[PDB]
Amino acid sequence: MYTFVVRDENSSVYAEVSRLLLATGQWKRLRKDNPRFNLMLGERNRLPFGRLGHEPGLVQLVNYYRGADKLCRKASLVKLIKTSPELSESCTWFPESYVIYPTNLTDEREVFLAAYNRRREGREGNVWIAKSSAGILISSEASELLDFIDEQVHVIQKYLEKPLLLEPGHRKFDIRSWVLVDHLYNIYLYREGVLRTSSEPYNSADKTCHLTNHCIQKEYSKNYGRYEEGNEMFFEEFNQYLMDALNTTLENSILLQIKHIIRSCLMCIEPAISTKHLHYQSFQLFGFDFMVDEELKVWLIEVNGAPACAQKLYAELCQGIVDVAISSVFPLASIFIKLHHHH
Amino acid sequence: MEVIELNKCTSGQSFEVILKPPSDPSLEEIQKKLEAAEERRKYQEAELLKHLAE
Amino acid sequence: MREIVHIQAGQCGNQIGAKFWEVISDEHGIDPTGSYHGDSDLQLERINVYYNEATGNKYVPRAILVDLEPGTMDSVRSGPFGQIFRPDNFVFGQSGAGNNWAKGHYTEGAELVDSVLDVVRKESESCDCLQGFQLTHSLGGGTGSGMGTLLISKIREEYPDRIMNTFSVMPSPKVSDTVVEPYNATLSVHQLVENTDETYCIDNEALYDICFRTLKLTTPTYGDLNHLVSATMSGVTTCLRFPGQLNADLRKLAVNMVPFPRLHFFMPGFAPLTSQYRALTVPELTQQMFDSKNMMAACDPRHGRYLTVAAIFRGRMSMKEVDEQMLNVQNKNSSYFVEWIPNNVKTAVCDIPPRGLKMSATFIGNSTAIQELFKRISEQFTAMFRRKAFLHWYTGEGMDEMEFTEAESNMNDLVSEYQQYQD
Amino acid sequence: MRECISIHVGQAGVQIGNACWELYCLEHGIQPDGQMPSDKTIGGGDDSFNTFFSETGAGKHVPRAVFVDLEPTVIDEVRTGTYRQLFHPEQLITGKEDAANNYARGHYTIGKEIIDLVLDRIRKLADQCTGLQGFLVFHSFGGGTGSGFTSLLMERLSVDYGKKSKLEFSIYPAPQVSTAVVEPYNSILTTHTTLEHSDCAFMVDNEAIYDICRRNLDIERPTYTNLNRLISQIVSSITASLRFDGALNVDLTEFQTNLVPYPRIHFPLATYAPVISAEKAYHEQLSVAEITNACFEPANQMVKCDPRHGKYMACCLLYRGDVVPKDVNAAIATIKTKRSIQFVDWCPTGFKVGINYQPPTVVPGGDLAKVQRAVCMLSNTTAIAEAWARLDHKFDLMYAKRAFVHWYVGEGMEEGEFSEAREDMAALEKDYEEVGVD
Numbered sequence A: 001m002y003t004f005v006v007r008d009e010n011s012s013v014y015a016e017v018s019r020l021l022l023a024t025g026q027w028k029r030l031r032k033d034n035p036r037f038n039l040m041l042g043e044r045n046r047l048p049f050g051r052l053g054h055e056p057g058l059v060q061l062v063n064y065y066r067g068a069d070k071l072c073r074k075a076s077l078v079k080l081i082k083t084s085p086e087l088s089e090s091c092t093w094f095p096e097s098y099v100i101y102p103t104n105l106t107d108e109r110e111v112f113l114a115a116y117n118r119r120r121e122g123r124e125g126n127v128w129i130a131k132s133s134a135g136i137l138i139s140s141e142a143s144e145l146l147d148f149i150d151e152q153v154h155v156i157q158k159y160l161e162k163p164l165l166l167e168p169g170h171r172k173f174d175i176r177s178w179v180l181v182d183h184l185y186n187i188y189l190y191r192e193g194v195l196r197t198s199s200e201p202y203n204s205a206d207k208t209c210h211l212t213n214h215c216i217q218k219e220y221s222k223n224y225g226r227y228e229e230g231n232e233m234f235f236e237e238f239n240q241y242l243m244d245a246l247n248t249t250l251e252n253s254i255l256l257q258i259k260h261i262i263r264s265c266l267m268c269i270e271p272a273i274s275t276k277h278l279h280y281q282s283f284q285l286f287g288f289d290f291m292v293d294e295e296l297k298v299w300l301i302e303v304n305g306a307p308a309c310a311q312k313l314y315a316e317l318c319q320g321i322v323d324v325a326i327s328s329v330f331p332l333a334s335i336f337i338k339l340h341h342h343h
Numbered sequence B: 001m002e003v004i005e006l007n008k009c010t011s012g013q014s015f016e017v018i019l020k021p022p023s024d025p026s027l028e029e030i031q032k033k034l035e036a037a038e039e040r041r042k043y044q045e046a047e048l049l050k051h052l053a054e
Numbered sequence C: 001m002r003e004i005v006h007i008q009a010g011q012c013g014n015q016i017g018a019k020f021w022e023v024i025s026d027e028h029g030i031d032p033t034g035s036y037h038g039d040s041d042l043q044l045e046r047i048n049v050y051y052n053e054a055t056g057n058k059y060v061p062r063a064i065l066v067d068l069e070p071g072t073m074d075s076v077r078s079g080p081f082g083q084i085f086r087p088d089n090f091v092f093g094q095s096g097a098g099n100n101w102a103k104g105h106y107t108e109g110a111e112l113v114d115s116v117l118d119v120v121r122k123e124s125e126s127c128d129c130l131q132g133f134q135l136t137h138s139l140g141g142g143t144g145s146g147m148g149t150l151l152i153s154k155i156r157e158e159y160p161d162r163i164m165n166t167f168s169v170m171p172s173p174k175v176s177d178t179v180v181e182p183y184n185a186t187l188s189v190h191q192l193v194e195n196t197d198e199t200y201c202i203d204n205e206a207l208y209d210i211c212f213r214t215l216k217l218t219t220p221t222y223g224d225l226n227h228l229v230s231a232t233m234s235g236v237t238t239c240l241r242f243p244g245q246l247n248a249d250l251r252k253l254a255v256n257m258v259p260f261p262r263l264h265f266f267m268p269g270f271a272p273l274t275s276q277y278r279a280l281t282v283p284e285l286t287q288q289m290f291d292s293k294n295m296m297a298a299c300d301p302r303h304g305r306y307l308t309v310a311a312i313f314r315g316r317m318s319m320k321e322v323d324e325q326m327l328n329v330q331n332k333n334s335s336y337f338v339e340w341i342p343n344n345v346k347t348a349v350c351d352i353p354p355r356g357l358k359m360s361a362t363f364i365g366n367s368t369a370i371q372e373l374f375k376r377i378s379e380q381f382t383a384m385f386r387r388k389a390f391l392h393w394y395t396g397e398g399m400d401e402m403e404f405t406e407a408e409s410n411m412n413d414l415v416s417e418y419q420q421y422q423d
Numbered sequence D: 001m002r003e004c005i006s007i008h009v010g011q012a013g014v015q016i017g018n019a020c021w022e023l024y025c026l027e028h029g030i031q032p033d034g035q036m037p038s039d040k041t042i043g044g045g046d047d048s049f050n051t052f053f054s055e056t057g058a059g060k061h062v063p064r065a066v067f068v069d070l071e072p073t074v075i076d077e078v079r080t081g082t083y084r085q086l087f088h089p090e091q092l093i094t095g096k097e098d099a100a101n102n103y104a105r106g107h108y109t110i111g112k113e114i115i116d117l118v119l120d121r122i123r124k125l126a127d128q129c130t131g132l133q134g135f136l137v138f139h140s141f142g143g144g145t146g147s148g149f150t151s152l153l154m155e156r157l158s159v160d161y162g163k164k165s166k167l168e169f170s171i172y173p174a175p176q177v178s179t180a181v182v183e184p185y186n187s188i189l190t191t192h193t194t195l196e197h198s199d200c201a202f203m204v205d206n207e208a209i210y211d212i213c214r215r216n217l218d219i220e221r222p223t224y225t226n227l228n229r230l231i232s233q234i235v236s237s238i239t240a241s242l243r244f245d246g247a248l249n250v251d252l253t254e255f256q257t258n259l260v261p262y263p264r265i266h267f268p269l270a271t272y273a274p275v276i277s278a279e280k281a282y283h284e285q286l287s288v289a290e291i292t293n294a295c296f297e298p299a300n301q302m303v304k305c306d307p308r309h310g311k312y313m314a315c316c317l318l319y320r321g322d323v324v325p326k327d328v329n330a331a332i333a334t335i336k337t338k339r340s341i342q343f344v345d346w347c348p349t350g351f352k353v354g355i356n357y358q359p360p361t362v363v364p365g366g367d368l369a370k371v372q373r374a375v376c377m378l379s380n381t382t383a384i385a386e387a388w389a390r391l392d393h394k395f396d397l398m399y400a401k402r403a404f405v406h407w408y409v410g411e412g413m414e415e416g417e418f419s420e421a422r423e424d425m426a427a428l429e430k431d432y433e434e435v436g437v438d
């Protein structure tokens, strides 16, 4: 009889995982402040990692990797990619980005304007996007970007002016991948992804057709649910489209680059966050966001440390979380693609 | 990777390697606290004996 | 040298006290004449806690025997180990207490209490560093209950910085001598609330149920009940009598077990209780030791929460496996342990097992379920007191009805204090 | 030469002190009767080992040590032990009844009655000293004596020896071997009152020593004897620079200079390697790079925590055995490219290295295997604040219900000392966070 505690009531993924654990009759839920647990489904902010692994005779496991925020923050990710030799400033699958602290507060204002002027003179496309972890501005003039940030830390990265546009619709999208990293630092890619598509035609000259967020398309798009249920295209339909239209597969044109990016990011922080020789063990589910351009090149947009799942895929993924992440440590009485790597 | 201040002797040696440059109460006051706590113990014991006398 | 002075008062107190000294004398190699005949130096390392050493390598129990009738103490002096006690430590009268708390506490007992204190003082003077007292008595009679609590009050007056511990036998209608037992017990419980640091609640109801249900004894006697008490008393004093690190003296036990001064009433337990050659395993010892059927207080632990727990394992066993089973019980039923006292379950191990057992385990719980015992007594008190039934036995000794009303209120306050920490 | 006086308080301090002086005698070739054949200056001298040992005209080398306990049974093990001849009765102070796991009982009630006797026996040792450096104080956090009397003694030493340094070796409570539920209370209480009186304190978590004994020595249920022999090895590594010829950490003041830039943050993390079972008939000797790499594994630290999620303020490496500076620098350069070693911006990113060619001495018949080389890293990480957060959280749980508080108030302590001690710890946790978190 294993024990666990629940400390994030808003987590839809682990609300289902908790439901599955009780459904086996071999897991007992305790009060959230009971320290005699085998498994902690921890809170998002200020998880007390320092109090884990000090209970005699209890193998303790937590559903978050301490230090993984460096990969799952806007400014932290840019700094991590630029300063890590495994990724380097010459990284080819991440858009050119710059960390811009507001003036009411290192910083890269002069470095951003240096490369911005190189595109203005060279007749090239000079459209950038500003955003943060906290409200997004897309512009072609560097003055509007720097003035908007001053109005928390923000980042300015190159806006991909030539995205892959689904037809019919001439519309933008982005790919969400769910990645599970277990206590042995095996990297498991959920075989099922989702395309969060825009329902408006992409106009290169209004942010409804430029931002593919599921909440923006349901509150400001006048074509929500027109082409696919809930602006969510799954891998079967997207693969069939790439074959019928582009004469290629999702595996070859896109998924090889996705698995490569996932490995690069997670292997880079492995020495910093691994729990291999630690007094407690960690796993975590990540949500990677990818953009695809017209040349079928995949770009990394962000990594989400506390992601939600697609409604159709909750039961399959949450059961997979119990199988390879929880039952591998606490056995009872494949939907993932294991991305092999060198520890 | 600079080794500085190397000192050697028969039983060993010591040195420093730099990888990167940077970027009371008095005796009276103690006796007062010890005696104030002793007085609180004496007051609690006197209240007990008073209670037992009743 | 951390000496304990033992006192046994009344019929129940002297019969259970005599068996305690008979049991631990055997465990320490002391023969009925006080001569050591053991084979291990572990038996004499802490022997001075309970025994005085006299001329001729004789060991004399540091025990004072008190009663208002001579009968039971004459039986003790004629018992198996009767000659081992110091003859001047028999302090007795002739009138008796008539199962009357007022007689023990206010009239008959007041005439004898000073001569008992003279013997207490003599034993205390010959102590290198007296740590405190232990009293065996029942709460349902007159001498052990009334004069025993009078003794505790006067001992606290003369030794206010020493620990007072009692083994207190609670009355039950299942094993009853008179109808006034709830009166005597209610009056005594308030005395214990104020004037003891640790009280082991030995419930005659539990002792009967164990003999009947578990030990399959259709007609349990007082001898059978005292067998469970004797085995329990040896177990809960092992840490005082043998070398160890946990709860090695009465004050450290109190600091570990008593988070609030009035809530110092312990539910003891013992395993095994076998009706006999089969070896018992550590998982079996640990499960039985926490089972309600092994509790000596007739309270369901699952109806309350454990504030603190001490567990003592005796015999040659895997100390690693003990920790595994102890941590197994806590981590499988952590809802019955308060979360605001971290690591409130302490485990000790002693190599020397009791007589006739390869291994055993003793349970000492400070549980809020003990309020069931006091509620039970309180209801039996009120059923008679609402009609003032049998009160003339007490008003005839000078007591007023108001002292009964205040005793009734005091124990209901105690019940309420247990209830606030259960939530 | 400048002398150091060791003070052992309570059961933990005395039993650990007994294990340390046993090891010191083996390391300096001192026999149980106090005779030291290699010492050619009979009856005197100012060699490095004289910082810890005085000498009698008869050639006995006597520890500069005081043992204090409020119960006589533990120190009686010293009076009748193997090394009984080292000590004279003036060095062993026993009481009648202990502090019963109660800080207030050891500090106020019993402390007031024995503090003058202890300081007098210390003064006798200080008068033997031509230039006393200060004191090394061994005690537990959880015991009533180790916590309560120690903090009182530390206050009086600051008064009577104001210019002297004071270092601690403190045993942090672990429930797997602890004997009291109130040890979190005693720990916070003694830390609050000792904080401004200690220049540098080495905390040892019994949990870490316990698991090292089970994992690396294959002891199923480690005893105090197993734990104390390992602790005395770490302690010896730390004090070896005071007892042998050298140039790093040669006096007590240098410990603070090299490890404690901010005075309140004076708790360096100790990590030791290698720990090898003696029952292994043949074990492959670990290299300089491997034992140095093991200094960044949490499984080898004296306190379980994660230095990756903190910042370093200082770092010393103390090697013993066959080690040359070339192999140290090769290991450090490799480790810098594999470990998350982040220093604070107001401190140089460097390592002070000390090497003693004599390999670690092991007690004959003990559990530790003789090794060719060993290292103790002393790093001042903010990550050790995890140990404070664990302790303060257990304090908060009990104190919210005032559980066991009456035991302390009954000894004359006011309840406000509880909240005052806890607020000081909250300020301590805040200091660690401001230094090591972005």
Ligand SMILES: Nc1nc2c(ncn2[C@@H]2O[C@H](COP(=O)(O)OP(=O)(O)OP(=O)(O)O)[C@@H](O)[C@H]2O)c(=O)[nH]1
Binding pocket: D009, D010, D011, D012, D013, D015, D016, D069, D070, D098, D099, D100, D101, D102, D106, D140, D141, D142, D143, D144, D145, D146, D147, D171, D172, D173, D174, D177, D178, D179, D183, D206, D224, D227, D228, D231
């Ligand atoms: N490592 C180690 N820890 C010990 C030893 N002895 C006791 N401890 C720890 O110290 C704490 C208890 O404090 P003690 O030193 O035994 O108590 P004390 O200082 O003598 O104070 P008193 O309450 O008066 O007995 C517990 O956490 C024990 O685990 C020892 O020999 N080695």
Ligand SMILES: Nc1ncnc2c1ncn2[C@@H]1O[C@H](COP(=O)(O)OP(=O)(O)CP(=O)(O)O)[C@@H](O)[C@H]1O
Binding pocket: A095, A129, A131, A157, A158, A159, A160, A161, A173, A174, A210, A211, A212, A213, A287, A289, A291, A301, A302, A304
């Ligand atoms: N450099 C770039 N080029 C083109 N489009 C971009 C872009 N950066 C962001 N976008 C678009 O903006 C949208 C939101 O980006 P961002 O990832 O900051 O939002 P978000 O983090 O709130 C989504 P989630 O809820 O999964 O974390 C994405 O759907 C993407 O299509």
Ligand SMILES: Nc1nc2c(ncn2[C@@H]2O[C@H](COP(=O)(O)OP(=O)(O)O)[C@@H](O)[C@H]2O)c(=O)[nH]1
Binding pocket: C009, C010, C011, C012, C013, C015, C016, C097, C098, C099, C100, C138, C139, C140, C141, C142, C143, C144, C145, C169, C170, C171, C172, C175, C176, C177, C181, C204, C207, C222, C223, C225, C226, C229
């Ligand atoms: N367990 C046990 N209980 C007893 C024994 N003798 C009496 N009692 C109980 O004690 C109460 C009677 O008190 P008793 O000791 O005989 O009166 P006293 O001599 O005036 O103190 C009743 O509740 C009895 O059930 C005994 O030998 N063993």
Ligand SMILES: [Ca+2]
Binding pocket: C111
């Ligand atoms: Ca008369």
Ligand SMILES: [Ca+2]
Binding pocket: D039, D040, D041, D042, D043, D044, D045, D046, D055
């Ligand atoms: Ca000399």
Ligand SMILES: [Ca+2]
Binding pocket: B024, D158, D196, D197, D198
């Ligand atoms: Ca000072």
Ligand SMILES: [Mg+2]
Binding pocket: A302, A304
């Ligand atoms: Mg996001």
Ligand SMILES: [Mg+2]
Binding pocket: C011, C012, C141, C177
């Ligand atoms: Mg009777």
Ligand SMILES: [Mg+2]
Binding pocket: D010, D011, D071, D098, D143, D145
């Ligand atoms: Mg002690």
